């Protein structure tokens, strides 16, 4: 209403990774805008990436169903999800062999959802138990519980400051978290249904949510509240991933139809409308510059746009 | 250069290794076992055995495939069945203990009702529709000695029939296709699995062969 | 984890010689070998590579049509077969493990290799010097030269250092001239345009004599040269 309109902004395609017969539900994107991490559905950790366009590892792993790929910002630990409780960690720079296993996390009762990084030794892990505990490779066992959300979490969502993160679960709010002390600062409501997937403003002022009530909003942290709502009249599904830009001035959010949509800021005008895909999105990532992003869907396509 | 040169043939041969393992996944028949709480989910694992979800494997008559037990898991099904999107065969082991105990604590109705709407769930759904789901009926002596003390009717008003072993044993198959929509495109099985002999296996594990074909036949077209 | 090399004894002009490698601890179906060799006169020097899984192969061009390579995955045996070998030839040959990825630090491990004593197109790199007296700890800055010009898509440096240590191989801890491997502190850097390189050494600890190894990684036969020594 007072910001200038960035008007209609044509999106295309970059790249197209094809090699890959399994499911492709997580697409975690590198710090350093180079590799980035898929998950499969048989127990295969591939990693591939834009420009080179060739992958660079994959081994056969003792759990076949993978829900996540947690990608390290320096590139050196690796760890994917499954239904059966075994977060196993990987590595990629192993002398006299090319992947391997030393530390063994175990102890979940929930199935895990998705696996965050917060840097080379601890980590965060998103259970289906109401448990989005951090856990550590050295001691094995987990330093802090988070626990206050009635239903099980499924997305989760790190500060680029490396001191708190975000977490919403099916209750239709999200929670904001301490690493240090280890509990619930601020509780955010006003979704209509259960949310998928949760991402944090590069600035860290707010975070946007998306849920299946065809509505998104970014709720504010000193202001306690959302500033402005997306909403949507021809639009039923929902939204299964949300995602900000370099500096978050540019919204995306992947629908049910087979496609993506690219909000503003405050305008709330689709500038940007994506199409191509086969099967439902279900994850997408954003590089730390912002110049391309990749999609995630069920059919096997990890196409680059750019 | 020659870091790129040799970039190409790793390429190569790492999606000649894919391939193979796409191919070697794609000949083993993928079952998921699910049932309702303690419905036989153990008795049944240890029959095959000797001739947080469970992953098992038994190779018969020059077959080999994987399946997964769903195990101890309390979680909704919204998000559940994502994972288990595009299985061949659901496995059902429904129980014959559930309609004798009082109702639950924490559950609205009895264990029979939670089991009845559990199955509707999970086929009356809207994503996966092309698949199969098969029933196993487990426990079936200490069922007919129960059913021969204490009647069946009493819990069941909608019907006025017998109480014997086969009409018992031949009418809870009728009662599941009631609750289906689409039937031109679903089918139930339902085979009876002995407790007392392993030899049993065998008649269900044919069975298989029935359904698998189906799903052949769905890159066919022609139905 | 492991390279013995084992072959070694005497041999004629003419004749036939087996040298073989056992090898084990480590996935031999995705590692590259290489078959550099080293003589107590002359430096390194590149004689054949082959890609895994046994893939493309490569040699030289003094040596494609003489000499026969062979893999073995299951047993994990090298083999090497000399045809017609001349006496201008003689030096100790090594076995060495390396992996090509995109950001990858290949050449950590080598062979110890056997003495085999003997009795009676192609680009070329330069160097900069042969050997010079500098005392510990005097910020000593490598310079090298190059006749290519670099214009590659990524933009870094495709040269590998190596470093000639009495008593095991000459593993690898400076590669692309800009990153830090495993093993060695980062300590040092590198710089210079498309054509010069300066490589800069910094608080130099003791028993630092060893001769310094320059080499190109775009094309296969590794020109590797003279190198530069340093004294006490």
């Known amino acids: 209403n007072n910001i200038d309109p960035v008007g209609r902004i044509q999106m295309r395609t970059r790249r197209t990774l094809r090699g890959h017969l399994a499911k492709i539900y997580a697409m975690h994107w590198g710090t350093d805008s180079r590799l980035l991490v898929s998950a499969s559905q048989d127990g295969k950790l591939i990693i591939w990436d834009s420009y080179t366009t060739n992958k660079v590892h994959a081994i056969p792993l003792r759990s076949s169903w993978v829900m996540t790929c947690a990608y390290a910002p320096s590139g050196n630990y690796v760890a994917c999800g499954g239904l059966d409780n075994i977060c196993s960690i990987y590595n990629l720079k192993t002398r006299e062999g090319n992947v391997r296993v030393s530390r063994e996390l175990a102890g979940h009762t929930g199935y895990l959802s998705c696996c965050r990084f917060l840097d080379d030794n601890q980590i965060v892990t998103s259970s289906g138990d109401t448990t989005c505990a951090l856990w550590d490779i050295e001691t094995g066992q987990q330093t802090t519980t988070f626990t206050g959300h009635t239903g099980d979490v499924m997305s989760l969502s790190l500060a680029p400051d490396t001191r708190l993160f975000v977490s919403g679960a099916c209750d239709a709010s999200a929670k904001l978290w301490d690493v240090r002390e280890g509990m619930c600062r601020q509780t955010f409501t006003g979704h209509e249904s259960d949310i998928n997937a949760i991402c944090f403003f590069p600035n860290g002022n707010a975070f946007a949510t998306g849920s299946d009530d065809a509505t998104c909003r970014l709720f504010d942290l000193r202001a306690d509240q959302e500033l402005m709502t997306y909403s949507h009249d021809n639009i039923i599904c929902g939204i299964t991933s949300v995602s900000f830009s370099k500096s978050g001035r540019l919204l995306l959010a992947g629908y049910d139809d087979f496609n993506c949509n690219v909000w503003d800021a405050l305008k709330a005008d689709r500038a940007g409308v994506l199409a191509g895909h086969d099967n439902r999105v279900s994850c997408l990532g954003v590089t730390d510059d912002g110049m391309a992003v990749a999609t995630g869907s069920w059919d096997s396509f990890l196409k680059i746009w750019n | 250069s020659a870091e790129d040169k040799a970039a190409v043939e790793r390429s190569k041969m790492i999606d000649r290794n894919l391939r193979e393992d796409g191919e070697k996944a794609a000949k083993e028949v993928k079952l998921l076992l699910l049932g309702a709480g303690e419905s036989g989910k153990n008795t049944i694992v240890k029959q095959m055995k000797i001739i947080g979800i469970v992953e098992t494997h038994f190779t018969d008559k020059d077959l080999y495939f994987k399946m997964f037990d769903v195990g101890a898991q309390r979680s909704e099904r919204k998000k559940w069945i994502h994972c288990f999107e595009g299985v061949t065969a659901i496995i059902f082991c429904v129980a014959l203990s559930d309609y004798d105990l009082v109702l639950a604590e924490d559950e609205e109705m009895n264990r029979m009702h939670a089991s009845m709407k559990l199955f509707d769930s999970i086929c009356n759904n809207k994503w996966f529709t092309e698949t199969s789901i098969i029933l196993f009926l487990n426990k079936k002596d200490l069922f007919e000695e129960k059913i021969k003390r204490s009647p069946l009717t009493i819990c069941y008003p909608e019907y006025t029939g017998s109480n014997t072993y086969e009409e018992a044993a031949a009418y809870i198959q009728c009662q599941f296709e009631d609750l289906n929509r689409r039937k031109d495109t679903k089918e139930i099985y339902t085979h009876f699995t002995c407790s007392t002999d392993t030899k049993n296996v065998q008649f269900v594990f044919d069975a298989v062969t029935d359904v698998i074909i189906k799903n052949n036949l769905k890159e066919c077209g022609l139905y | 984890v492991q390279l013995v090399e084992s072959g070694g004894g005497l041999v004629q002009p003419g004749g036939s010689r087996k040298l073989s490698c056992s090898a084990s601890?480590?996935?031999?179906?995705?590692?590259?070998m290489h078959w550099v060799r080293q003589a107590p006169e002359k430096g390194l020097e590149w004689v054949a590579y082959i890609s895994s899984g046994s893939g493309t192969i490569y040699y030289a061009d003094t040596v494609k049509g003489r000499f026969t390579i062979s893999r073995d995955d299951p047993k994990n045996t090298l083999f090497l077969q000399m045809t017609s070998l001349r006496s201008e030839d003689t030096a100790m040959y090594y076995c060495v493990r390396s992996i090509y990825y995109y950001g990858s630090s290949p050449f950590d491990f080598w062979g110890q290799g056997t003495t085999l004593t003997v009795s009676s197109s192609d680009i070329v790199m330069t160097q900069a010097t042969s050997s010079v007296p500098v005392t510990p700890g005097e910020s000593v800055s490598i310079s090298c030269r190059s006749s290519?010009?670099?214009?590659?898509?990524?933009?870094?440096?495709?040269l590998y250092w190596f470093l000639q240590r009495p008593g095991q191989s000459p593993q690898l801890l400076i590669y692309?001239?800009?990153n830090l491997a495993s093993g060695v502190p980062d300590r040092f850097s590198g710089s210079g345009s498309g054509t010069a390189f300066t490589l800069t050494i910094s608080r130099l600890e003791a028993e630092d004599v060893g001769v310094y190894y320059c080499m190109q990684h775009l094309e296969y036969p590794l020109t590797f040269g003279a190198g530069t020594k340093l004294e006490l």
């Open positions: 601890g480590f996935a031999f179906s995705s590692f590259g």
């Open positions: 290519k010009s670099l214009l590659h898509s990524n933009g870094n440096t495709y």
């Open positions: 692309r001239m800009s």
